[PDB]
Structure formats: structure tokens, C-alpha cells
Amino acid sequence: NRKIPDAQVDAIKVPPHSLEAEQSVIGGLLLDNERWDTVSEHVMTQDFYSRPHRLIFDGVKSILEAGKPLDLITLSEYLEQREQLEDVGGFAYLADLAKNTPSAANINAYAEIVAERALVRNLIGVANEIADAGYDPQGRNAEDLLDLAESKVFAIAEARTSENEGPKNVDSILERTLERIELLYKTPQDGVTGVNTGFTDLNKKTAGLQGSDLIIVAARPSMGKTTFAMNLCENAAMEQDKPVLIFSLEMPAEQIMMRMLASLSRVDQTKIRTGQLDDEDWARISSTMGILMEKKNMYIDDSSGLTPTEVRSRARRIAREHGGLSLIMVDYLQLMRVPALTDNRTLEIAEISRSLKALAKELNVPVVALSQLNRSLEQRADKRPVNSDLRESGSIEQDADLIMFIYRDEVYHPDSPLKGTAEIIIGKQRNGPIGSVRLTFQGHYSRFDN
Amino acid sequence: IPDAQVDAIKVPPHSLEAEQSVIGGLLLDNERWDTVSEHVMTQDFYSRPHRLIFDGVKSILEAGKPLDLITLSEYLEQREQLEDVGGFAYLADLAKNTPSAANINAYAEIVAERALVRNLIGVANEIADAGYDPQGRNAEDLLDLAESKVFAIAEARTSENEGPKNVDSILERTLERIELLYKTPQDGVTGVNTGFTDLNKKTAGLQGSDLIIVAARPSMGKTTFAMNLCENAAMEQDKPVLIFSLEMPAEQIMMRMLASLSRVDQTKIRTGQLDDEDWARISSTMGILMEKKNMYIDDSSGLTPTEVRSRARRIAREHGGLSLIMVDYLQLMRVPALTDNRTLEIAEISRSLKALAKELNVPVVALSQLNRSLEQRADKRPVNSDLRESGSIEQDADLIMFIYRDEVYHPDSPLKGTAEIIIGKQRNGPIGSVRLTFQGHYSRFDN
Amino acid sequence: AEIVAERALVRNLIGVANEIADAGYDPQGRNAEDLLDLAESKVFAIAEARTSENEGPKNVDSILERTLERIELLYKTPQDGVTGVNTGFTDLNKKTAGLQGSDLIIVAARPSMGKTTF
Numbered sequence A: 001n002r003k004i005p006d007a008q009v010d011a012i013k014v015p016p017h018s019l020e021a022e023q024s025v026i027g028g029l030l031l032d033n034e035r036w037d038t039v040s041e042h043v044m045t046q047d048f049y050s051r052p053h054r055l056i057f058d059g060v061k062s063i064l065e066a067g068k069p070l071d072l073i074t075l076s077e078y079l080e081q082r083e084q085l086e087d088v089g090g091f092a093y094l095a096d097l098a099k100n101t102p103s104a105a106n107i108n109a110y111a112e113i114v115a116e117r118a119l120v121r122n123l124i125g126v127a128n129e130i131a132d133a134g135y136d137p138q139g140r141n142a143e144d145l146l147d148l149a150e151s152k153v154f155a156i157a158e159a160r161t162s163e164n165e166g167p168k169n170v171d172s173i174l175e176r177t178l179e180r181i182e183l184l185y186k187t188p189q190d191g192v193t194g195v196n197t198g199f200t201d202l203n204k205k206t207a208g209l210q211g212s213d214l215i216i217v218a219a220r221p222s223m224g225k226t227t228f229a230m231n232l233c234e235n236a237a238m239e240q241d242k243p244v245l246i247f248s249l250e251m252p253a254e255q256i257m258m259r260m261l262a263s264l265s266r267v268d269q270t271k272i273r274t275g276q277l278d279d280e281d282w283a284r285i286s287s288t289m290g291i292l293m294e295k296k297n298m299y300i301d302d303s304s305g306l307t308p309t310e311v312r313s314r315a316r317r318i319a320r321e322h323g324g325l326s327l328i329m330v331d332y333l334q335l336m337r338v339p340a341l342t343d344n345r346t347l348e349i350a351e352i353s354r355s356l357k358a359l360a361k362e363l364n365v366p367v368v369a370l371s372q373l374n375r376s377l378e379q380r381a382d383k384r385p386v387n388s389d390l391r392e393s394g395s396i397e398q399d400a401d402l403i404m405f406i407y408r409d410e411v412y413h414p415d416s417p418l419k420g421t422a423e424i425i426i427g428k429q430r431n432g433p434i435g436s437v438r439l440t441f442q443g444h445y446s447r448f449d450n
Numbered sequence B: 001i002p003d004a005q006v007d008a009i010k011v012p013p014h015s016l017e018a019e020q021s022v023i024g025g026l027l028l029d030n031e032r033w034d035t036v037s038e039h040v041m042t043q044d045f046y047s048r049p050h051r052l053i054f055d056g057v058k059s060i061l062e063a064g065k066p067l068d069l070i071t072l073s074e075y076l077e078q079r080e081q082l083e084d085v086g087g088f089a090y091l092a093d094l095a096k097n098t099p100s101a102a103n104i105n106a107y108a109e110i111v112a113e114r115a116l117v118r119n120l121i122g123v124a125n126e127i128a129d130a131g132y133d134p135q136g137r138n139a140e141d142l143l144d145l146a147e148s149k150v151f152a153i154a155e156a157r158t159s160e161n162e163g164p165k166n167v168d169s170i171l172e173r174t175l176e177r178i179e180l181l182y183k184t185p186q187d188g189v190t191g192v193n194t195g196f197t198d199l200n201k202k203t204a205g206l207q208g209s210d211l212i213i214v215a216a217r218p219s220m221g222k223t224t225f226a227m228n229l230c231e232n233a234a235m236e237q238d239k240p241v242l243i244f245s246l247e248m249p250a251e252q253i254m255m256r257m258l259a260s261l262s263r264v265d266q267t268k269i270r271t272g273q274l275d276d277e278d279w280a281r282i283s284s285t286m287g288i289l290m291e292k293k294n295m296y297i298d299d300s301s302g303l304t305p306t307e308v309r310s311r312a313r314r315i316a317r318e319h320g321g322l323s324l325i326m327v328d329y330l331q332l333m334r335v336p337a338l339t340d341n342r343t344l345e346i347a348e349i350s351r352s353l354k355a356l357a358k359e360l361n362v363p364v365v366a367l368s369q370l371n372r373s374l375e376q377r378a379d380k381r382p383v384n385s386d387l388r389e390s391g392s393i394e395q396d397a398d399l400i401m402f403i404y405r406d407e408v409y410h411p412d413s414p415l416k417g418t419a420e421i422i423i424g425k426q427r428n429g430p431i432g433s434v435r436l437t438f439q440g441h442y443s444r445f446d447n
Numbered sequence C: 001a002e003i004v005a006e007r008a009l010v011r012n013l014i015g016v017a018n019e020i021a022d023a024g025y026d027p028q029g030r031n032a033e034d035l036l037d038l039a040e041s042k043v044f045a046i047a048e049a050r051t052s053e054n055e056g057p058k059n060v061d062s063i064l065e066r067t068l069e070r071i072e073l074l075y076k077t078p079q080d081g082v083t084g085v086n087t088g089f090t091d092l093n094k095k096t097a098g099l100q101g102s103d104l105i106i107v108a109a110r111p112s113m114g115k116t117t118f
């Protein structure tokens, strides 16, 4: 029983490592300084297990970043200046590192091994931290511990998310371009290549709601911004097998559903609210409900003050159940929060916009985000909304792939000949033309028609 | 005994390894003496044996004699100094322990740096001694003595490697520059060809080290114009073109490029309604682009100036330089250290891009948006003040070009299909305007 | 008070010399250029503290003497309309009498007005 713990302590206390790969990376850089650009993309100083190798690698990094030639003497002088040469094993050990790896062109493979070992080392460290938190919660509830575990594991995965993206040569872009064209040609392209908007005129200009697109729908209050976005959701839910995810930060799920019922059933929204539904109204609502229940392809999250991380987490959860998502709608971008950027609202909104674009690319799903137009527009009130009206609220234009504005002349001019008509202005579009689409606005039904 | 000895550092700064590498390196090449002799002197060596050896190296090379292990050993033997340096074996060891060439200049700089610190410590001790024992000198005299001795150390390292400041250095660099211009074909273009004759007449091409700001209101063809400059650089230069597309994906930039070089309707490319002629033109254009392989497209979002610089250096190392660097929208870049101030953040990005242009000796084209205040006026052409409101980028730009289309503001303009390129600022040429044919269908500017 | 100040000056100088010596022996990652800049900065700081020490009392008799000394110097030098550094522009020299010593001159212009040229 006394010989059992010594072998177990030696085999369990040593984390995964590769001293040989670490030595080969260092030795290889001493042989060919030009490989630093590639090696620096794979490994960081903290990726090394051995303390002496971290100090040596830090020296290598400092010399090469300064544009100085990396050799045994230069590195030794660097470490000597910081009184770290004795801590790494002396000049003899540096010479041994250069001697023990006479082979070049394999340095990238050794860098990947060092990075892989560091990843497992970080994973074990996180597992121990989570275990410690589980044993000693220090006042944290189960939900907080689950969120902590998810956050720490997600951080490990995020670090290894886009590791080898640097080199972007024309041959690679041509292959991806042809692959994309091939995919479009294989799918039925009768004017719509993405998620159907339900509006022919809009689809003619946008070719549908594209995957990976961050779409900003902006309007002044009561222009039908929520109404328009919901019609896009309704169309995606009725035409796609994949689910629609709605983050209703302003309105409750019951209210969104009631408006949806008013829209799909073409029943007066006021009648639904007041309960004065006739036999015909009940039959239409019931038929609509029957279809919605048959489809079951819609999720409504009415949680307030969600962070981009929480939005991403919930989206991934649902996407895993169905092998993807048809559309993600975020009710009001400005209602989201970023605890790290509370000191600056503009930067906070800019980060939310960047995070939602990253979410769109990550899940290959169109992300519709609703935004409010700046108050300065009402002072002018002479022309249609423009991109500058949104720039004043967080520079969201830079991250958006598509910007759509909602304008109703009847709101500003009740005697307008365009009563019941809403203009959808394309303010920005990466994969199509800019312009305007006229839609029939039916406020009583909370619906837009072509 | 050891505790007091460990705490006391009586050994001045030195690098025996660098000294050996300088000596060993000269024994390997001889031609590097001219460069090494500019950085180090015999007295710069800490070690007595290395000073004697280096003195021997200096005497042989100044006499025009070949420097080898035997010649140096015979030289030292004649002066009975061979035993003082460690014998022939030590000379052979010096030649053996440094098998690497092209780093001798770096070792020479280390030896010179150590000698500088050694002289500084000596002066500090002299000043300390003068402070303890003034020998009749007042405080003012001691301050003047300290200033004089420190100024003497600084003066020795003033103008070591050509010393750019004095007229003799500027004359040499001026003649070298003229010589380089005369060796290259100068038919009106001394830099990177813009592809527009009228523009080249005014700018003499896109110069190396220039930070070029291309600014325009939305839909004026800002991206289109910058891309035509990239296309021309890619077709006329052997060195690669690097594009940082922060707003558009690489596929979209390529599709617009295909529309431009092939003169095929951009809408047709998008819709796929290409006729036999359209396919033949696109295919021929693709064949050439693939043959050249001189273009890189980086579509990463929110890049920092450091990341931009890092990627640019990586590519430049593969080809011995770059023909042109294009950064799609300056305002889309980020500086984590300056998040509290957008104006300062943009100003730092502009300074960093100018530093990048000088560092790699490459023209850097950066696209910028004109301020919204211009639309409120809408009575005249864009001016430099329209850009100053967005980060004071004018101060750092070597060339500022504005894009103006009268047809956008006035659809009934007689200048339909014409875009005016306004030179708002130019360091090495005149200011003015160039009229170009804007072909929106092809995403192209023509002369 | 002057003796106490003089002694303090030498005391600070010795302290700085020891700091520079310590930095020279132990550079802690600083290159020679950084150590030279550090030495220059610390020595310059000692000199700057004793730069304008007795300037407080400014009585009219002292100002009159300096005024007359200045006038005397101007009268000894050829003053054919230029008392300072010649601008090369007669009309400008007529108004400025040249570029005077101790003057901070701000030349301001919008871009391309020829500010650097002037």
C-alpha cells in the first residue's frame, strides 16, 4: 500500500507535454529565423510546459519582433542582460537545443504538437477549477456554476477557433469562389438563393436573406419595424424546415405570438386584443395555430438584457438540435448589454454589432437585428432615412452586410397619396443593389404585403 | 567571502561571444572589414587578447593583405604577442566557433554598445570621485565637468552609420536616389503605375513610402477606383499586391475585379446570365490572374495596425517586397489602447499606416469616408476640411485624392459617366483635378 | 541658504552618479541607447532644478539697466531695418525687423497654402 501512491503521484501530477517538440521549435528558429512568422501563428510563450523553454522562447520572440537576427550568441546575451541565462541552464543548454534538432521544415509540425499539449494542459486546469468550484461553491448557485463551466470551456474552444487563417493566396480564393458558384448552381435559383423574404420585389433585389449576413432593420418609432422583421420570420418559418430563433428583448412572447396570429390569419389585431372575435375570426386563428403547431419550427426567447455571449450560447443550443437555423432575429440591438464596455455606449453597441456578425458567420445563418434611427432625423424631417442616421448610434454600418430602412410618408404627412404604403429603403447591400421597395402596410393586421 | 563577492559586480558589461564572432567572421570573409571598422574600434573590445588579435586584423586588412589564420598568427608571432592571446589554437578556435556569416554587423553593434556602457560606467565613477573629492572645484564646475564628459560619450556615437543630418550624407543619398531613378524606365512614371495617363502626369505614379488617402461619399466609386489601381499594379509589377478588405469579402472583390478586367456587366456576373462571349472574356482574365499570382486578399474584420503590419511583412519576405498595400476603410480598423477616443484612434491608425509605408518602402492606399457635413452644404467639390473632421488624417497623408460625381447629385448633368478625381494634397507633385470615365456596369475607371 | 542648496545639489549629483553606475552594472533589459538617455535625463533634471533660482525680485532699476543694455546692443549692430534674422522679404522685414532671438513664431495655414514652402 506504500508503493501505490508514489507511482500514482508521478503519473498523475505530470500534465501532458513534449519537451522534444519544444526543443525542436526553439532549435529550428535558431537555424532559420524566417520561420518565426509561421511558428508565431501556432504557439504562444505560455504554450511551453517547461519554465526554461518559456524564457528562451520569450527571448526568441523579442529579438525576432525587433527585426534582429536570432543566433545562439544574441539569444544568450539577451538572457544574460535579464539575469535569466542561469535560469534556463546556461549557454551550454542553448547550444544543446540548436544541436539536438538538425532538421528543418518540420518546425510547424512541432509547433502544432506544442500547441496541442498546451490545449490539453489548459483543459485539465479548467476541469480542476470546475471541480474545485463544484466542491466549494463559495456562495454560487448551480446555475452560476453551470455558466462558469460553460464560459471556461467556451474560452478554451474560442482560442483554437481561427488559428491558421493568415496566408490568403489567390489560388485558395479561386477554389472557394468556384465551390460557392457550384453550390448555388446545384440549388434551385429561381431568383432566391438564401432565405425567402416573402416579398417578390425585395427578393428581386436581395436574392433572399443570405447565410452569414448581418441585417440591420432600422426605423423611427411606429414605422412597423417589428412588424416587418416578424413577417420575414413568418415566411422563413413557413418555407424552411430549419427553426427560426427570435430574441424578443422588448416584447413578451405572448405579444409576439398575438401579432403573428393577427398577421397570418389576417384578423384585426384590436379584435384579438379585445376578444371580440366572430365565428370567422376564430376559424382563421384556429387554422393558423394548427399549422404553427404542425411546423414547430419557431423559438421565442423573451429574456431581457442579454449579452452577445448568452445570445450565441442559446443559438448554438437550438442549432445543434436541428443541424442548423433558418433565421436569427434580435429585436433591439441597443437593448443588449456588454458588462465589459459599460463605460462607453457607442463601443458597447459596436461590439454587439461585431459579435452578431461573428454569430452569423459561425452558424451560417442570416441574423436580423432591429435598430432605432437617431433623433436628429426628426429635426430634419425633409428626406428619407440615410446611413448617417445609424452611424450616430454605434457605427453599426461597418459591420452590417445589409441595411434596410422603413419609411412611411403617411406618418409624417397624413394627407399623403401613399396611404397604406411603406417604403423599404436598401441603405447598404454587399451582394446586391441599393434602392427602394414599396410594400403595402396593413397596421390592422400587423402585416406587410407585396 | 562568497556572499560579498556575489553581491558586488566588479565585472563591467561585455560580450566575449560577440567579440569572438566579429574576429571569427572577419577571418571567414575579409570584405566585411569596411562595415565592421565603421562600428567598432580596437579599444571597444573588453578582452586584452581580443584587442591584440583585432589590432592584427586591422593592420593586415588596411595593408590590403588577405586575412587568414596563418597570416594573423605570423603577424602576432613577429610581435611576440601570439602567446599573450592564447596561441595558434585559440585563433583556430575563434574561426571555428563562429561558422555563421551576415550577422557580423550585429555582433559589431553589440561590441560597440558594450564599449559605450563601459565608458559610461567609467565616466560615472569619475564624476562620483569628483563629487567626493572636488579638489577646489565649485558645484557649477562639477556640473560642467559632468555635462562635458557625458556629452563626449554621446558625441562619439553621433553619426556612426552615415549619420543622416549633415549635408555630406544628404548629398550621397540624393545622388543614390537620382541614380536609381535614372536606371529605371522613367517615361513619366517613377513609382507604381496608376493605369491612368492623366493621373500619372500629375503624380508620376504611386510613390514608395507614400500614404495615399482616397476619400469619397457613398457610391462615388471609391472601392472601384482603388481596385483599378490594384489591378494595374498587379498586371504591371512582379511584386505582389496586398489587399485588406475590411468591409467586403474576398469573393466579392474578385467578382468586381472580373467585371473590371473582362469588361463584362457586373449584374450579368451576379445573375449568372453570361453569354458565350462573356464566358470567354472572364476565362481569359482568370487565366492571366492565375498565371501572375501576384495578389493577396485578406478579408479579416477589425484588424489592428499591428496585425496589418505583421501580415504585410510576412508576404513581403516571400517576394523581397510589395508593389502596393490597399486598406479598404481606415475607420473600420481598431486600436484597443485608444477605445476612449475615436479621433485619436483614427489618427494613430493613419500614423501607423504611414510608418508601414516607410518601413516596407511601398505605397499604402487607404480608403476613407467624407464627413456627413458635406451633404448639408452640397454646393461645391469635396475639400481637405471634410476629412479633418474624421481623425486629422490630412497631416499624415502624402497624397489625398477625392472622388466626385456630378451625375450623383445632378442626374441631368452633362458630365454623365464622368468622375472627377481631385488631388486635395500632394507632397511630390501638383494639386488639381483629373477627369475619368466611370463605367458603373463594369466597376471600372478609364482614361 | 546658498551653502545648504549647493550641498544638496552635490548630494543629488552623487546619488544620480550611483544610480547611473548601478544601471550600467545592471541594465535590467535596457540597451546602451536607453541607458544613455536615462543618464542624460537624470543629469538634465539636476541642472534644470538650478536653472532659474533667483528670479523673484524684479525692481524697476534692474529693468532699466537691462533695457538700456538692449538698446545699446541694437545701436552697436547694423540696423538698416533688420535687427534679427533676415526673412529675405523686404516688406516683411519692414514690419517685423527680422526674426528676433527668443521669439516663438507660429506659421499657420490651411493645407496647400504653402506653409512648409514659406
Ligand SMILES: Nc1ncnc2c1ncn2[C@@H]1O[C@H](COP(=O)(O)OP(=O)(O)O)[C@@H](O)[C@H]1O
Residues within 6 Å of the ligand: A219, A220, A221, A222, A223, A224, A225, A226, A227, A228, A269, A270, A443, A444, A445, A446
Ligand atoms: N390595433 C391597431 N390597429 C392599427 N394599427 C395598429 C394597431 N396596433 C398597432 N398598429 C400599428 O402597428 C405598428 C407597430 O409598430 P412597431 O413595429 O411595434 O414599432 P417600432 O417601429 O418602434 O418597432 C404601428 O405602425 C402602429 O400604428
Ligand SMILES: Nc1ncnc2c1ncn2[C@@H]1O[C@H](COP(=O)(O)OP(=O)(O)O)[C@@H](O)[C@H]1O
Residues within 6 Å of the ligand: B216, B217, B218, B219, B220, B221, B222, B223, B224, B225, B266, B267, B440, B441, B442, B443
Ligand atoms: N450592377 C451595377 N450596375 C451599375 N452600376 C453599379 C452596379 N453595381 C454597382 N454599381 C456602381 O458601382 C459603385 C459602387 O460604389 P462603391 O465603391 O462600392 O462604394 P463606396 O464609394 O462607398 O466605397 C456605385 O457608383 C454604384 O452605382
Ligand SMILES: Nc1ncnc2c1ncn2[C@@H]1O[C@H](COP(=O)(O)OP(=O)(O)O)[C@@H](O)[C@H]1O
Residues within 6 Å of the ligand: B426, B427, B428, B429, B430, B431, C109, C110, C111, C112, C113, C114, C115, C116, C117, C118
Ligand atoms: N509640382 C508642383 N507644381 C506646382 N505647384 C506645386 C507642385 N508641387 C507642389 N506645389 C504647390 O506647393 C504647395 C505645397 O504646400 P505645402 O507647404 O507642402 O502644404 P502645407 O500648407 O499643408 O504645409 C501647394 O500650394 C502646392 O500646390
Ligand SMILES: [Mg+2]
Residues within 6 Å of the ligand: A226, A250, A251, A331
Ligand atoms: Mg419591437
Ligand SMILES: [Mg+2]
Residues within 6 Å of the ligand: B223, B247, B248, B328
Ligand atoms: Mg469598399
Ligand SMILES: [Mg+2]
Residues within 6 Å of the ligand: C116
Ligand atoms: Mg510640412
